[PDB]
Amino acid sequence: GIASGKVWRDTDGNVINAHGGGILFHEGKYYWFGEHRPASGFVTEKGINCYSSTDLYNWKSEGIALAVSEEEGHDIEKGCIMERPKVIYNAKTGKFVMWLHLELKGQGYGPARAAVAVSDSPAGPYRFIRSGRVNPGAYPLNMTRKERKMKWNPEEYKEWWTPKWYEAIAKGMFVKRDLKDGQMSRDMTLFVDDDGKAYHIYSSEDNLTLQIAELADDYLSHTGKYIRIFPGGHNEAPAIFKKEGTYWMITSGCTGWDPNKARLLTADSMLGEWKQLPNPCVGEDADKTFGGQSTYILPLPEKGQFFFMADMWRPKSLADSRYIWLPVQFDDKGVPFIKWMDRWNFD
Numbered sequence: 001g002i003a004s005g006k007v008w009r010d011t012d013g014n015v016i017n018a019h020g021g022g023i024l025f026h027e028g029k030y031y032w033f034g035e036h037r038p039a040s041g042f043v044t045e046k047g048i049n050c051y052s053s054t055d056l057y058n059w060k061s062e063g064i065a066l067a068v069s070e071e072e073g074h075d076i077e078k079g080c081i082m083e084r085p086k087v088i089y090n091a092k093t094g095k096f097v098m099w100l101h102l103e104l105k106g107q108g109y110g111p112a113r114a115a116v117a118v119s120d121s122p123a124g125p126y127r128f129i130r131s132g133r134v135n136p137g138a139y140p141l142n143m144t145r146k147e148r149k150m151k152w153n154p155e156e157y158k159e160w161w162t163p164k165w166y167e168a169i170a171k172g173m174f175v176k177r178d179l180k181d182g183q184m185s186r187d188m189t190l191f192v193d194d195d196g197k198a199y200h201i202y203s204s205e206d207n208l209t210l211q212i213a214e215l216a217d218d219y220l221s222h223t224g225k226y227i228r229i230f231p232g233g234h235n236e237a238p239a240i241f242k243k244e245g246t247y248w249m250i251t252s253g254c255t256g257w258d259p260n261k262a263r264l265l266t267a268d269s270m271l272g273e274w275k276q277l278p279n280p281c282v283g284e285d286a287d288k289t290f291g292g293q294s295t296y297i298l299p300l301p302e303k304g305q306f307f308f309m310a311d312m313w314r315p316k317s318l319a320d321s322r323y324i325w326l327p328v329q330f331d332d333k334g335v336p337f338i339k340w341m342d343r344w345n346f347d
């Protein structure tokens with residue numbers, strides 16, 4: 001059984017340490033990548049951890065897939081923050097590509113970068129390539145003529161959350177601020193579409209606005225084509241899937257480590273217009289996403305099924321943080337919802 005919120009252990013008997021994670025399937029096995037968290041403090045001592053399974057119940061430790069660097073001044077030197085890793089397989093190159101949220105050593109959460117690394121094998125080791133803010137010099141495809149010409153005197157908009165500040169954010173003030181050096185990227189995920197095009201989905205503009213950016217054909221860089229959605233909405237922790245033509249994304253709000261009400265977002269084209277729907281969680285404690293925060297949606301295409309993965313964060317001992325895994329169910333109109341079960345089994 002899958003017992004959400006309990007202590008899960010690997011085949012050696014050690015607590016599973018793979019937070020903010022996601023999963024892929026390759027050559028007959030599932031690989032689970034996530035943050036290696038410490039028992040005290042919050043910044044990783046090690047990097048990105050990996051576990052493998054044939055059955056989704058029994059997990060073998062494969063070791064650290066992307067390690068912090070021992071080189072002075074390196075972008076991923078020990079002391080850097082590495083969060084919310086995701087791995088995708090590129091069918092054209094035959095490589096495994098990892099993207100993650102990086103903050104440079106000693107700089108807090110200021111830098112707001114995405115990083116990319118590559119492996120010939122699913123478990124690693126992965127080789128770091130580069131990091132940065134996203135699409136320097138490019139405007140979003142859906143920013144209007146009028147919005148692009150506006151100018152915003154920064155001395156006039158110092159106080160956050162005034163009516164004039166909120167309107168300015170909605171119309172793209174922080175896009176223009178960050179245009180030259182690139183858009184900010186904190187919480188993030190990846191999605192490979194049915195045409196083989198991959199997308200990098202991230203919280204941008206001081207976490208206020210979601211952006212969706214097309215990747216190059218090798219998945220190692222951005223093309224310049226991107227959209228911005230829900231400006232000022234403070235959507236975080238994105239998880240995404242596609243079913244029968246329709247895109248579905250689950251997010252949290254922005255309340256630190258505290259659980260909050262999940263949001264459901266939908267579109268009929270990845271770079272088209274998106275809409276916000278009610279909280280997909282139902283039943284007791286649905287108002288706090290069952291004490292969790294979204295991380296990934298795993299498809300099982302052989303069954304036409306989908307499963308919701310979340311973290312149950314314990315900020316006072318982050319390594320003791322737990323996992324919530326629950327089936328996605330669908331209503332009469334095809335819209336996904338999620339119920340809590342103490343114990344359930346895969347078909």
Ligand SMILES: OC[C@@H]1[C@H](O)[C@H](O)[C@@H](O)c2[nH]cc[n+]21
Binds near residue numbers: 256
């Ligand atoms: O900063 C600490 C944590 C991590 O960055 C999580 O990945 C992110 O979802 C979040 N939101 C608010 C606080 N935090």
